[PDB]
């Protein structure tokens, strides 16, 4: 949750909430996809240092981050751009390689 | 990075198909290949049908089969039911960035 309309140069805060689990003991990917069907990575972190690495796409104007007691993981868009445009996902890793669940998407629209 | 061909795929029921993927980096990484594959159902989110490149997910019925070397891996469905139309996308987990494949539609040849 946290998607809609929002004007170019916004600012918005996408929410994931996590259940089945413990939030803190796998990692998380926000990934989105846009009207044309393309997929693309968002961003990566590590959920325990509060760490997120990302694309040049957003390097800068996203920022991923999560709480651990409260099973939740944030994405705080800035500055967006009409390419921003896509349904966002968020999805619980598994192992190392590829992701356990889980999220129903979360349409954002930058007009 | 990764290259995914082909574009469309018309397959018949009972056919059998194969779509392939080229990764601009090695995606081996401690002994394993982080390289999986995703059907995203018309109208939902993607699912995981293999990962770490061959590995079938529990769930997914034995359609599937994943393979590859060096930077060629391949998604094969022996048997095409009707259920697996949708598009396909292979997405690797060895560095960083992660990334996806542009997509295979599978579309099922009919009268």
């Known amino acids: 949750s946290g998607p809609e309309l929002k004007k170019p140069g916004e600012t918005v805060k996408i929410s994931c909430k996590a259940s089945?689990?413990?939030?803190?003991?796998?990692?998380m990917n926000w990934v989105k996809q846009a009207p044309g069907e393309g997929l693309k990575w968002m961003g990566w972190?590590?959920?325990?240092?509060?760490?997120?690495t990302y694309a040049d796409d957003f390097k800068g104007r996203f920022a991923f981050s999560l709480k651990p007691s409260a099973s939740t993981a944030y994405l705080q868009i800035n500055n967006l751009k009409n390419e921003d445009m896509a349904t966002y996902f968020c999805?619980?890793?598994?192992?190392?390689?590829?992701?356990?669940?889980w999220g129903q998407g979360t349409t954002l629209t930058v007009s | 990075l990764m290259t995914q061909i082909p574009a469309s795929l018309a397959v018949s029921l009972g056919q059998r198909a194969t779509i392939s993927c080229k990764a601009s980096?090695?995606?081996?990484?401690?002994?394993?290949?982080?390289m999986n594959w995703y059907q995203q159902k018309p109208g939902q989110p993607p699912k995981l049908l293999i990962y770490?490149?061959?590995n079938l997910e529990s769930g997914i019925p034995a359609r599937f089969s994943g393979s590859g070397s060096g930077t060629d891996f391949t998604l094969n469905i022996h048997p095409v039911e009707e259920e697996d139309a949708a598009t396909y996308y292979c997405?690797?987990?060895?560095?960083?960035?992660?990334?996806f494949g542009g997509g295979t539609k599978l579309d099922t040849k009919r009268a």
């Open positions: 999805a619980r890793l598994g192992y190392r390689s590829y992701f356990d669940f």
């Open positions: 089945g689990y413990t939030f803190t003991n796998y990692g």
């Open positions: 972190i590590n959920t325990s240092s509060g760490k997120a």
């Open positions: 980096q090695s995606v081996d990484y401690e002994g394993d290949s982080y």
């Open positions: 770490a490149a061959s």
């Open positions: 997405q690797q987990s060895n560095g960083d960035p992660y990334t």
